[PDB]
Amino acid sequence: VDKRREINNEHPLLMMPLYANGEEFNQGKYTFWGGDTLTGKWENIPDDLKPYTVIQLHPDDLPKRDGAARDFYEHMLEEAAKYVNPKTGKNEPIPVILTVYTAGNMPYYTSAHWLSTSWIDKMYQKYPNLHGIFSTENYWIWANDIENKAADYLKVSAKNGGYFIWAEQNNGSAIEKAFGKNGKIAFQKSVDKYWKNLIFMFKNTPAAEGNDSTTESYMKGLWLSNHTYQWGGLMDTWKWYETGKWKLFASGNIGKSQGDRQWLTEPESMLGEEALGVYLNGGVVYNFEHPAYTYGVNNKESLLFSEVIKEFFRYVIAHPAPSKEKVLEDTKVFIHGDYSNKGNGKFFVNVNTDREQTPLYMTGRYNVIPAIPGVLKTDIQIKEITSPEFSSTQARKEYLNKLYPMNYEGDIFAQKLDNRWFVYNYKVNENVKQTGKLKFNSLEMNVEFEPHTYGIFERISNGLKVNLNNFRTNKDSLWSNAQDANQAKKLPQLTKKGAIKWIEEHYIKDTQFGEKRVTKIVLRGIDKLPTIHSLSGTNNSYDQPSLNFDQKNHMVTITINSNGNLEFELHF
Ligand SMILES: C[C@@H]1O[C@@H](O[C@@H]2[C@@H](O[C@H]3O[C@H](CO)[C@H](O)[C@H](O)[C@H]3O)[C@@H](O)[C@@H](CO)O[C@H]2O)[C@@H](O)[C@H](O)[C@@H]1O
Numbered sequence: 001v002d003k004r005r006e007i008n009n010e011h012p013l014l015m016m017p018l019y020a021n022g023e024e025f026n027q028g029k030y031t032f033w034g035g036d037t038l039t040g041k042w043e044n045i046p047d048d049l050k051p052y053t054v055i056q057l058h059p060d061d062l063p064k065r066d067g068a069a070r071d072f073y074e075h076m077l078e079e080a081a082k083y084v085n086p087k088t089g090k091n092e093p094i095p096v097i098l099t100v101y102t103a104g105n106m107p108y109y110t111s112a113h114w115l116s117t118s119w120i121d122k123m124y125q126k127y128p129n130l131h132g133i134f135s136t137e138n139y140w141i142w143a144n145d146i147e148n149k150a151a152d153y154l155k156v157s158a159k160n161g162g163y164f165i166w167a168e169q170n171n172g173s174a175i176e177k178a179f180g181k182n183g184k185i186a187f188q189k190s191v192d193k194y195w196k197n198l199i200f201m202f203k204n205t206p207a208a209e210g211n212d213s214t215t216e217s218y219m220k221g222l223w224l225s226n227h228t229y230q231w232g233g234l235m236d237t238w239k240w241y242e243t244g245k246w247k248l249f250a251s252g253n254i255g256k257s258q259g260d261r262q263w264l265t266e267p268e269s270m271l272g273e274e275a276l277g278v279y280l281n282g283g284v285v286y287n288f289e290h291p292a293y294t295y296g297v298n299n300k301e302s303l304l305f306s307e308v309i310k311e312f313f314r315y316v317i318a319h320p321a322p323s324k325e326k327v328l329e330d331t332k333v334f335i336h337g338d339y340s341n342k343g344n345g346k347f348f349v350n351v352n353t354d355r356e357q358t359p360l361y362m363t364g365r366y367n368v369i370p371a372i373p374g375v376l377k378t379d380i381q382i383k384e385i386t387s388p389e390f391s392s393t394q395a396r397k398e399y400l401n402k403l404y405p406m407n408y409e410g411d412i413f414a415q416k417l418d419n420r421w422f423v424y425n426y427k428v429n430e431n432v433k434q435t436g437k438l439k440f441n442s443l444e445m446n447v448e449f450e451p452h453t454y455g456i457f458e459r460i461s462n463g464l465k466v467n468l469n470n471f472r473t474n475k476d477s478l479w480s481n482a483q484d485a486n487q488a489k490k491l492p493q494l495t496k497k498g499a500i501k502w503i504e505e506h507y508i509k510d511t512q513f514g515e516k517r518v519t520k521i522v523l524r525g526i527d528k529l530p531t532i533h534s535l536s537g538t539n540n541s542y543d544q545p546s547l548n549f550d551q552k553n554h555m556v557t558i559t560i561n562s563n564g565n566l567e568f569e570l571h572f
Contacts, residue, residue: 117153
């Protein structure tokens with residue numbers, strides 16, 4: 001009954017994936033794709049991050065037969081258990097999560113098929129450093145006993161004080177079915193008893209089906225109604241492949257033809273825009289794919305990891321996400337019903353998303369509207385999804401606009417928490433600048449952002465604290481020798497091994513950094529020239545900000561030219 005770890009706003013969780021190399025396993029070697037090792041990966045995690053990070057083992061392409069996954073996982077659990085910190089010479093067992101269920105655990109899809117609940121119980125009992133087990137991506141192969149198995153995973157975790165973590169997207173009603181929509185109620189009943197040992201996360205991989213908004217809505221609503229202990233999201237750069245995108249901003253669609261070039265191409269800073277939807281809504285668990293780009297290779301941090309994810313995760317440790325009680329205090333509408341019956345992701349298009357195929361929001365006015373599936377009972381206006389207010393786009397906005405007042409101006413994403421404005425440009429693959437006007441009392445701030453740019457603006461006693469992130473390296477070289485989408489489609493495959501080698505050769509080193517680009521901040525109602533203090537950021541990535549003070553009009557325009565992360569304070 002005693003929890004093996006805490007997971008909450010004060011103790012968030014960053015999952016650190018390590019994917020088994022099946023070819024090398026057949027040869028009697030225990031290795032991970034990308035050349036990370038269990039011990040070296042752990043060692044290389046900043047010490048300040050170690051208490052909030054857990055190694056997640058994934059069996060990837062281990063042989064699909066009995067014993068392969070048990071053998072690999074036992075080897076790695078042993079390595080983790082006997083780890084010695086050297087500095088301190090002390091045995092400090094590495095915390096681990098095992099991937100136990102994926103692709104419906106079909107024997108033609110995964111070695112995880114041959115991991116029994118009996119075996120999981122035995123591992124929990126043997127290894128105190130085993131903190132949880134992980135189910136991921138089953139929406140497209142929704143197996144006959146998936147809900148029964150999920151109950152067993154939750155029960156066996158609760159019995160041992162560990163967590164059952166499930167990452168899933170609402171394609172084909174997956175989240176609704178999980179709780180009993182179609183009559184499979186084992187997991188619903190398991191949750192009734194064991195919700196404090198459950199973590200439920202979105203998995204935004206299937207971007208072409210547009211279920212980002214509805215899945216996140218459910219994750220939040222499940223949390224708020226005590227159907228999961230905490231929630232989070234797995235954010236996946238394979239979304240670029242799923243939607244058929246190629247060179248940044250280029251026109252034309254290539255479909256699913258260049259996988260390994262495609263999962264490299266999503267702007268680094270855009271993962272931070274995705275992750276803000278988790279943070280701003282009380283979520284505390286974070287995970288990413290493709291691991292080589294989002295985390296790194298060979299026990300080294302990728303620039304995406306170092307410049308975006310690590311900065312972002314440090315921010316949410318230093319500023320804990322809003323508590324359940326706070327999020328619940330702020331909630332004005334809570335939806336009860338099935339999004340699958342109301343157009344799915346279409347439900348929020350032109351309400352707070354700009355298109356079907358996006359992991360972003362276009363306004364923070366309503367933040368994320370929480371919901372639970374209609375099969376669940378309750379247990380703030382609680383509104384049935386079939387109520388007249390939700391029948392159309394315009395009905396949704398009119399109803400919500402009475403309960404959620406307009407709190408900023410401009411076509412841009414922004415959301416306010418206490419003294420902090422959170423802002424991003426919501427464009428995905430269109431090179432359009434956006435502007436907003438935000439207020440702290442009193443103080444009036446305009447901003448102008450290019451795409452793939454987020455900022456956090458905190459009113460402090462002597463001014464304004466600013467965190468900016470627009471880190472975006474140049475991926476054009478991956479798309480060399482292709483003048484249009486037809487040509488790009490026909491490029492030689494980069495290949496899985498080739499992409500790992502590209503990261504080693506041209507991303508970890510010899511980086512093709514993006515161009516510096518302009519952000520404008522305009523302060524109004526200003527008496528004298530503000531000063532800049534505590535200026536730091538990504539190495540060699542920003543010019544000294546330029547100020548222009550218009551004394552009469554009580555305004556200062558600050559021009560930043562940068563490509564990276566950045567922070568400073570303005571005193572005024
Ligand atoms: C069923 C699902 O399989 C894996 O995700 C795939 C993904 O697989 C490739 O990339 C991953 C790392 O991101 C591994 O290297 C795999 O070996 C690769 O084959 C892609 O094929 C995407 C395309 O959208 O589809 C996903 O299904 C795995 O990462 C998941 O956790 C899950 O087990």
